[model samples]
Target: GSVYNTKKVGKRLNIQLKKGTEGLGFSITSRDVTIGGSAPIYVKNILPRGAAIQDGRLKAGDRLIEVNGVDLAGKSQEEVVSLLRSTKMEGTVSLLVFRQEEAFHPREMNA
Candidate 1:
């Protein structure tokens, strides 16, 4: 039938993504963590630091600019995740994160 032919022509394909964290992943959830507040980390007690949800082991304010010599700042969330989960990476996976207040690639801690 015409319908069957159309469906075949425009068949939705699920391209298998190799070496990446995909399919059924926990949605990124970020919140502020007290160093030595001596308080519990409950939903009500804890406060909303900000919406720092993306992917990977990226902490809050960790802006992933590049991955394996690829600029990921202008890419979408999916692209960035894909780049991060690559297996053919060399040494350290350099990143350009923007801390609350610090210099370029400078490690800053709020004490």
Candidate 2:
């Protein structure tokens, strides 16, 4: 029998926007997946000339794990929307994102 291995890697990204910036320059969406558990939010799109684009690290499809130290696991889509908007008013925002990547390993078989 051959052995196969698969792994899911996650990266935590930190993004900070400039004061008085119009917005984060990004839009977000949530997905209900059984594996990841309830309403996991993701960066759906990145707008041009926005803070997200300016930061250069933020990208579409990045999963939003936290905002300004607040965990977003149980929050609804609209709740997060309001939280982000309210946080943005403070002039600076910090985001924690989980970026997923896969790694695979297969054992070689001898003939």
Candidate 3:
């Protein structure tokens, strides 16, 4: 059997943040899209008035697909964490997100 690989289909967004020696004030949780499979990073929490929330585009439910142009889907959690943590000192950090509709809209909020 031939193994075929397809790129993940979804909206790709680029988020920019100004670090200036400060950290990106946000926490994240990771979930595998499939059982024991590739997991994408989810925004767990954002500090009050932090750089993330202040940007106004990032929210708790936004899915992280990449960090600074590096695709995270194939990377281990250690790599993902390192990519994020290492860029703290960079003047600007880029976050690519895929906002899931289910996560974006509450069950009750949806019609």
Candidate 4:
């Protein structure tokens, strides 16, 4: 399995998106809660030409902090999804996201 440590970096982003349109064109994954407080919700992927990418607000490795005025600090993946796509998400919805800086270490060395 691949593994590495990531550090939070960059300015937090706040994006406002309109409903009745294409999806955010992104995927998310939940992290395990532990020390230093609640685990963060991560932006796993982003599709090109999608609303998120087109807006240039979200990116892979970005961490989600809140949806609208609700804090997502301790929510499950399903719960987060529900918040983002809920019925009340009509019109313009807001999202707060943070970026992560990743560090990868390869085990094998080229000969």
TM of each candidate vs. truth:
0.33, 0.70, 0.68, 0.64
Alpha carbon deviation, residue 2, candidate 3 (Å): 44
In the order shown, the candidates' Cα RMSDs to the true structure are 19.7, 9.2, 9.3, 8.7
Q: What is the lDDT of residue 46 in candidate 1?
A: 13
Which segments of model 1 are wrong by more than 4 Å?
1-59, 101-111
Clash pairs for candidate 4: none
Q: Write the per-residue lDDT of candidate 2 for residues 25-90, one digit (tens) a residue.
A: 888876774434476778888888678888877899988888878887567777776666665566
lDDT of 1: 0.32
Query: What is candidate 4's lDDT per residue for 1-111, written digit by digit as tens?
Result: 997644454566788756435566666766673422366677878776556777777877788888787777566666776665564546666778876554566769788
Off by over 4 Å in 2: 1-8, 19-21, 33-37, 85-87, 103-111
Best by lDDT: 2
Q: Could you tell me which 10 consecutive residues in candidate 2 have the lowest summed lDDT? A: 30-39
Local distance difference test, candidate 3: 0.69
Of models 1 and 3, which has the larger TM-score?
A: 3
Worst 10 residues of 1 by lDDT: 38-47
Per-residue lDDT of 64 in model 3: 76
* 3 against 4, candidate with superior TM-score: 3
Query: lDDT of all predictions, in order shown?
Result: 0.32, 0.75, 0.69, 0.68
Looking at candidate 4, what is the lDDT of residue 32? 72
